[PDB]
């Protein structure tokens, strides 16, 4: 029993974190086989922040300009190249700790673990979701650039995020590991802002199922609704539309608890229209949307506490 915002164990990723210094700029890199991946911003100059032609900046560089430190061992850079907004630094030593891994790009609404890092040294691990507006609500300070986000599947690390910058609202933007930004953001200090966000409806429903599995049932009711009437109310509360695929994905949870998806939707409708009236769900006084159906199944017992 119990439900927490759980991250993946970070060990496999800790063993790939290195420090990359170019000039007076230091940030984190990801060392996999004989390549170190890091934000290309490492080559940017303090005055170039506004608009840095990275192609020129990289042309002006040589391998010896990149200081790469794996803990106490310096790695010799033997090649450098740019891939969109990340830089690939070939080094003369393959990381003996390289896990099995993949570079995957995730969808808004999916979750992942973040290993926050400073000077190549892991600092903390936490879970979050890719927001509908392609930002993440992370916890990052200066120096965290190059920290990565990931999901672990049978000892295989799927890297999905590299941290690049903080937007004016204090939320965070970055790239996949091919260096392509999530959302309409660029690696220059401009007036870019997050667009309007929405709540991830399928996740809220998954979390309500988690709550039932854990014995919170006060929000349940005898009513059911149709997908369209539900989505009509969702729109009015700035919730993503619920699709039939979401209903299908919630199937297993619906079977475990005996509560049909459209019945749970009627509960969500009431909570949106009425609030929680003094009450909490799984320790929260807000409807939580950063737990996918998969996260719930993985964390929660296969047996419901009836």
């Amino acid at each position: 029993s119990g439900f927490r915002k759980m991250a993946f164990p970070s060990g496999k990723v800790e063993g790939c974190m290195v420090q990359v210094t170019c000039g007076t700029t230091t940030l984190n890199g990801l060392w996999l086989d004989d390549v170190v991946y890091c934000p290309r911003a490492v080559i940017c100059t303090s005055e170039d922040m506004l608009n840095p032609n990275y192609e020129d900046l990289l042309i002006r560089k040589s391998n010896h300009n990149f200081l790469v430190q794996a803990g106490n061992v310096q790695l010799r850079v033997i090649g450098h190249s740019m891939q969109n907004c990340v830089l690939k630094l070939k080094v003369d030593t393959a990381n003996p700790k390289t896990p099995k891994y993949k570079f995957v790009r995730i969808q808004p609404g999916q979750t992942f673990s973040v290993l926050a890092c400073y000077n190549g040294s892991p600092s903390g691990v936490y879970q979050c979701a890719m927001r509908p507006n392609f930002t993440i609500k992370g916890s990052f300070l200066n120096g965290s650039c190059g920290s990565v986000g990931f999901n672990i599947d049978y000892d295989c690390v799927s890297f999905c995020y590299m941290h690049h910058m903080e937007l004016p609202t204090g939320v965070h933007a970055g790239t996949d590991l091919e260096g392509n930004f999530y959302g309409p953001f660029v690696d220059r200090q401009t007036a870019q802002a997050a667009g309007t966000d929405t709540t991830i409806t399928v996740n809220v429903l998954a979390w309500l199922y988690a709550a039932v599995i854990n014995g919170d049932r006060w929000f349940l009711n005898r009513f059911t609704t149709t997908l369209n009437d539900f989505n009509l109310v969702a729109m009015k509360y700035n919730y993503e539309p619920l699709t039939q695929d979401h209903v299908d994905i919630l199937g297993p949870l619906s079977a475990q608890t005996g509560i049909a998806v459209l019945d749970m939707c009627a509960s969500l409708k009431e909570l949106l229209q009425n609030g929680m009236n003094g009450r909490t769900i799984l320790g929260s006084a807000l409807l939580e949307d950063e737990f996918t159906p998969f996260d719930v199944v993985r964390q929660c017992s296969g047996v419901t506490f009836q």
């Binding site: 230091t26 200066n142 965290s144 650039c145 910058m165 690696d187 220059r188 200090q189 007036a191």
Partner: peptide, 9 residues
């Protein structure tokens, strides 16, 4: 007001 690249100097 303006975006912040989070390197370290």
């Amino acid at each position: 007001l303006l975006s912040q690249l989070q390197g370290q100097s």
